[PDB]
Design a binder for this molecule. Structure first.
Ligand SMILES: O=C1Cc2cc(Nc3nc(Cl)ncc3F)ccc2N1
Ligand SMILES: O=C1Cc2cc(Nc3nc(Cl)ncc3F)ccc2N1
Ligand SMILES: [Cl-]
Ligand SMILES: [Cl-]
Lengths: 124, 4, 124, 4
């Protein structure tokens, strides 16, 4: 086409979606990771994770307001990945990299799994 | 704004 | 912080949100612009438009599944702006610029209003 | 990935 494009638009949209999450505006699901609860927007979760895409495209699960993750999932790892979904920034540290990589494999977040593998390979 |  | 950042994340999220819109997945509102209807995600509309942000943060309106816009709004202008919200690309043409600018002023999309003003000034 |  003959369109013009605003370079910062996608980043500005994501920043506003994170501001809605902060303020608990139009959040429509609670993700339970053992004793912890995380509120989020189903659309953002589906856009970032192959697992959530599969969950919320299922005719029965699309209607649930609570999703319980596998008990092996670490809440801190999930929290770091949820922040990444809404900000593009990943708080990857020596003390959390194994939990983050395991959570990203479960959630099917291939780019995160890729950077974790590279950082682990560099330490070996 | 840019030409994409 | 000590975060790393994935450059293409925000663009990839927006591309996936547009794929959900295409496939009518988890769309939760219909915007009516005279005889036309447009399905969308309330969160994306709020992230892009000061008018939708005000509508869906209102305690009564946040619950509506149908929003009727002012009859003076041109459906083609709205369609071009909705595509911009989901893609960052604006289909601005000599034949639609006045309708697009008027719609962006109504929807409170300041960056769009800014580029329309500049393109109009260049023609004069 | 980059240092933001
Ligand atoms: O690593 C990843 C990240 C990821 C996100 C999605 N999300 C969607 N995919 C499509 Cl094609 N349309 C809409 C979507 F919301 C699917 C698979 C995967 N795998
Ligand atoms: O030209 C524009 C575009 C635009 C979008 C928004 N959106 C939100 N603003 C805030 Cl501060 N938090 C969450 C949001 F979804 C408000 C005003 C305006 N004016
Ligand atoms: Cl990813
Ligand atoms: Cl704008």
């Amino acid at each position: 086409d003959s369109c013009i494009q605003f370079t910062r638009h996608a980043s500005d949209v994501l920043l506003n979606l994170n501001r809605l999450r902060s303020r608990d505006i139009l959040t429509d699901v609670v993700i339970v990771v053992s004793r912890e609860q995380f509120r989020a927007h189903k659309t953002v979760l589906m856009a970032c994770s192959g697992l959530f895409y599969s969950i919320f495209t299922d005719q029965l699960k699309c209607n649930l307001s609570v999703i319980n993750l596998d008990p092996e999932i670490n809440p801190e790892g999930f929290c770091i990945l949820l922040d990444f979904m809404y900000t593009s920034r990943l708080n990857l540290r020596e003390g959390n990299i194994m939990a983050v990589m395991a959570t990203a494999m479960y959630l099917q977040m291939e780019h995160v799994v890729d950077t974790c593998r590279k950082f682990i390979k560099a330490s070996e | 704004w840019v030409i994409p």
